[PDB]
Enzyme design. Structure first.
Site, PDB file in Angstrom:
ATOM      1  N   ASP A  27      36.493  36.255  -2.914  1.00  0.00           N
ATOM      2  CA  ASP A  27      35.370  35.352  -2.699  1.00  0.00           C
ATOM      3  C   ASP A  27      34.048  36.091  -2.808  1.00  0.00           C
ATOM      4  OD1 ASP A  27      37.142  33.340  -2.312  1.00  0.00           O
ATOM      5  OD2 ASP A  27      36.912  33.283  -0.115  1.00  0.00           O
ATOM      6  N   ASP A  80      41.363  31.888   5.569  1.00  0.00           N
ATOM      7  CA  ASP A  80      40.827  31.505   4.278  1.00  0.00           C
ATOM      8  C   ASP A  80      41.366  30.122   3.967  1.00  0.00           C
ATOM      9  OD1 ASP A  80      39.600  32.331   1.646  1.00  0.00           O
ATOM     10  OD2 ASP A  80      41.620  31.882   0.988  1.00  0.00           O
ATOM     11  N   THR A 102      35.001  25.743  -1.651  1.00  0.00           N
ATOM     12  CA  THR A 102      35.922  24.622  -1.720  1.00  0.00           C
ATOM     13  C   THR A 102      36.332  24.126  -0.339  1.00  0.00           C
ATOM     14  OG1 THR A 102      37.759  26.151  -2.002  1.00  0.00           O
ATOM     15  CG2 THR A 102      36.756  25.277  -3.973  1.00  0.00           C
ATOM     16  N   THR A 103      36.598  25.030   0.598  1.00  0.00           N
ATOM     17  CA  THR A 103      37.026  24.564   1.906  1.00  0.00           C
ATOM     18  C   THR A 103      35.945  23.713   2.538  1.00  0.00           C
ATOM     19  OG1 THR A 103      38.321  26.568   2.174  1.00  0.00           O
ATOM     20  CG2 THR A 103      37.887  25.271   4.122  1.00  0.00           C
TER      21      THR A 103
END
Lengths: 515, 515, 77
Positions: free
Chosen positions: B379, B53, B86-87
């Site tokens: 998530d 993650d 976001t990643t």
């Protein structure tokens, strides 16, 4: 370039992770099987432990590398907890990691290596189901053969068969109506002196302590037991008080007043009707007198694990406050007696209320085999219990791994795709088990491997393996060398998952206050 | 010369900022997608966490560089904290930073690079609006595919469809009359043992604690709950008093008087009519008795996070002083029960007053995947909530990024002005996503990119992407691989803003005690 | 004055709010007292939701939840 730089740091990191895991595997590899070598563990204090139990090494090691810690965790934790297959998982894992290095050097991507290992592990799971042999959960002779196979090589050789029956009977007692085996009800105890022939099975729980005052009775029959989790002392005022004595007559009068308090505390204990008292904390010296004068056998500073095992065995409730202690809270045991064993002494609690509670008292001359037999017996309880629950066993002595390896090379020819290379490796990896077993016996590990392969050739013998005692390839079932199916599947599963972890980790990153 | 000297330190300083930003991006880049690799985090203490993650990595890392701290913050923060892309944003930002270096070396001024990236980012927003697909917030099948898409690769493969249905069911319950989803109302709890198949949904709030005294009732129905943020103890005078005892008879009287105080405290609590009691601090052992003797189920030293969720769920008010406790301040729950689970035991609060409280209980064999599945569900809750609120989705699997990339190179041909160079860069940058996705699957990232481009060419299939399982370019919508529109929009905006910041910073200056 | 400082979306909206606040605080002398205008900042929503408040804002919570959340005709100490 910045981002092409990280890719080189990560590749180093993965190769170091694989490297770290392989070292852990080789450190424990020689401990496998009846002839397994034992390792000498030494710490900062200088005292040492010499053991053949690989799980004990992996647990007690000084491991500094994060990748090693993780491989240990994944392989060590397993469902249903059989206990003797963990080391086999680690060894197979280290061999899979070796194979993975070459596959990665050949530009096989990690997920494809994992894809092959995952495919091959499942096929191994299925093959184990078909090779396994079904046995009655009530069949005691096979359960003894399970036991003897697991205890072999741990130093009990002389008394192996006797001690095995003791294990089978102990496990057979705790089987519930559901059919499941409750491991927590079986306690394993060890004390020096005498010999392993004197290992006995006790129908109640055993505590290692002495009665807190020698004035107390050594033996108590029809005992009403009280479990107290609170120290017996003068109770301070929570408000932090001091005391002034103006009158010399009062100086005794206060002391005599505290004496009254301790009597009343003991009186409340006897008011519950307790013959025997165990306390997790300590007992004031004067209270020890008043307990002795009342004829109560008591032990102080008892370990909480003892408190917990006593409560379930006798039916007593652990009590935090004297006000809570009541006659309903007491436990019942037929006999509570402090007896001397060779060397020091201990408190036996026998004829206990709960019939399932049982204890194995292991005797012997030398402590390092005492610890070893204890560690051996714990695995055997696990190994035997799994057979009762599962009712399926397989031939031991490396026969299973050789069958699986060959059938997997057969399966690998059928795979059309890139993971076939990983499948063949996974097959070859299983050969580390019999090869290790053969070399621990002082033989030529390679010729034994070939002989066993030859025995599995054609329709052959699925049970053929090396008999370390005769040095020849023989049927392991006819020689009674057998082990549970669940152990083999869990070892295959643990070996695959643990390597899958390292293979999926490309980089290692520094963090701050992780937990 | 002095001021031309700053310009050399600055332009290096800006390039050092980009360098740090690119390194942060690369550290997390390989974690994207179904096949995403996982990273091993290690701290000074030596304990480790392995996760794929990306947000957890960026949050838990050791990052020392101020530009790196800033890039993480800008990209991580989002208008709707519900759902995580976001990643992906960080990765695009790092690629946008790479391209910007080349434009700067070519003497494109930073504001012109920003002008192009801002222009390209807005055009991407509009295209996303036009490509997106609308779905009903009451449509259960689409929400399930959203979840499965987010959960893929997170380690629950056999439990994927089951676990997704539970999430959709859990999220669908929290939709209010406004239609908006409150993410805080969904609680995720995790404990090991059993298996992921045993993951269950609880209709009330869950606390992990044991009843402070075993003498207290395990179960209470029609519960009136009191939440106390003050310890239950003997109350000291803040005025610094000591106590002197002249008479031995009074030595007991003080003990007995403080005992009376504890009775008085318990009575006042029972006077409010509370059956169950939670306290964030500790309970004197003796007060524990009187609560049990009064028939009150109580727990001590409860975490503050539990305290607040109990208050919001049951309608109780958190109370700083025992005097504040009133019948109106009590919470209502149908049943409050301590239940034993496979591993341990916990206190369930169910049939709660306010239906909004809900808890996701995630089980599993190994803890390191427990955390992972736990992190994945958060998530999954995010993406589903956004889908219910927005009602728009796009095809996943990198299909969207390829479409945007081609349309932006098309848009770049239309730009008349010097920022054209930056628009193509932004367009080219988005292709890092499918390329990363392809390489994590063990394939040739460049051919996949070309094959996917070809599918989006001419008119083309806007949903076409690589199917990692079949290895072929397929329609991602037909395969049910979909993700919320808000995810893509928030990702592009955060990617662009975070890269615009570093790009807009010329110098780095030492400061004195900023905050 | 605001251009380039990061608003850039609704500049004029935010400017109209500034003008209104400043126009209100002009005293009888004609001089502007800046101290009566306080600038506060809190996350969430968007700058479009920036509002002008006719009273003073404190970032605190009532010290005990037992106190009334809302008070009308307040006498403040």
């Amino acid at each position: 370039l910045p981002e092409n730089m990280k890719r080189y740091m990560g590749r180093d990191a993965q190769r170091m992770n694989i490297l770290a895991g392989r070292i852990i595997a080789e450190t424990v590899r020689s401990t496998l099987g009846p002839k397994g070598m034992d390792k000498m563990l030494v710490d900062d204090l200088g005292d040492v432990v010499v053991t053949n139990d690989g799980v004990t090494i992996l647990r007690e090691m000084s491991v500094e590398h994060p990748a090693a810690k993780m491989l240990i965790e994944v392989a060590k934790t397993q469902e249903k907890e059989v206990g003797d297959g963990t080391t086999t998982a680690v060894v197979v894992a280290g061999e899979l990691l070796r194979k993975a290095e070459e596959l990665l050097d050949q530009n096989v991507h990690p997920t494809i290596v994992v894809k092959g290992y995952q495919a091959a592990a499942q096929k191994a799971q299925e093959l184990l189901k078909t090779i396994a042999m079904e046995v009655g959960a009530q069949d005691k002779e096979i359960l003894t053969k399970i036991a003897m196979t697991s205890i072999t090589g741990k130093g009990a050789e002389k008394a192996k068969e006797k001690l095995a029956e003791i294990i089978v009977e102990a496990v057979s007692a705790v089987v519930d109506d559901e059919g499941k085996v409750d491991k927590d009800l079986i306690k394993i105890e060890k004390k020096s002196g005498a010999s392993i022939d004197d290992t006995e099975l006790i129908k109640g729980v055993l505590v290692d302590k002495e009665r807190v005052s020698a004035q107390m009775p050594k033996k108590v029959t029809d005992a009403k037991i009280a479990l107290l989790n609170e120290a017996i002392e003068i109770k301070e005022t929570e408000t932090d008080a001091e005391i002034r004595i103006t009158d010399p007559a009062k100086l005794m009068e206060f002391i005599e007043q505290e004496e009254k308090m301790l009597k009343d505390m003991v009186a409340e204990i006897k008011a519950s009707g307790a013959n025997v008292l165990f306390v997790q904390k300590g007992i004031d010296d004067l209270a020890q007198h008043y307990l002795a004068k009342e004829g109560i056998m008591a032990a102080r500073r008892v370990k909480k694990s003892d408190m917990e095992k006593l409560a379930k065995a006798t039916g007593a409730n652990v009590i935090t406050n004297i006000k809570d202690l009541s006659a309903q809270d007491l436990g019942d045991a037929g006999l509570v007696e402090e007896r001397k064993i060779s060397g020091d002494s201990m408190i036996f609690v026998e004829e206990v209320k709960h019939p399932k509670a049982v204890t194995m008292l292991i005797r012997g001359t030398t402590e390092h085999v005492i610890e070893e037999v204890a560690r051996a017996v714990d695995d055997a309880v696990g190994v035997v219990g799994s057979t009762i629950e599962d009712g399926r066993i397989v031939s031991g002595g490396g026969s299973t791994e050789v069958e699986l390896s060959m059938k997997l090379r057969e399966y690998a020819e059928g795979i059309s795709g890139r993971e076939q290379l990983a499948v063949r490796a996974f097959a070859d990896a299983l050969e580390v088990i019999p090869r290790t077993l053969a070399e621990n016996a002082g033989l030529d590990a390679i010729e034994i491997l070939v002989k066993v392969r030859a025995a599995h050739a054609s329709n052959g013998n699925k049970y053929a393996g090396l008999n370390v005692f005769t040095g020849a390839v023989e049927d392991m079932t006819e020689n009674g060398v057998v082990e549970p199916l669940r152990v083999k599947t869990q070892a295959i599963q643990s070996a695959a998952e643990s390597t899958e972890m390292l293979l999926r980790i490309d980089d290692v990153i520094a963090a701050e206050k992780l937990r």
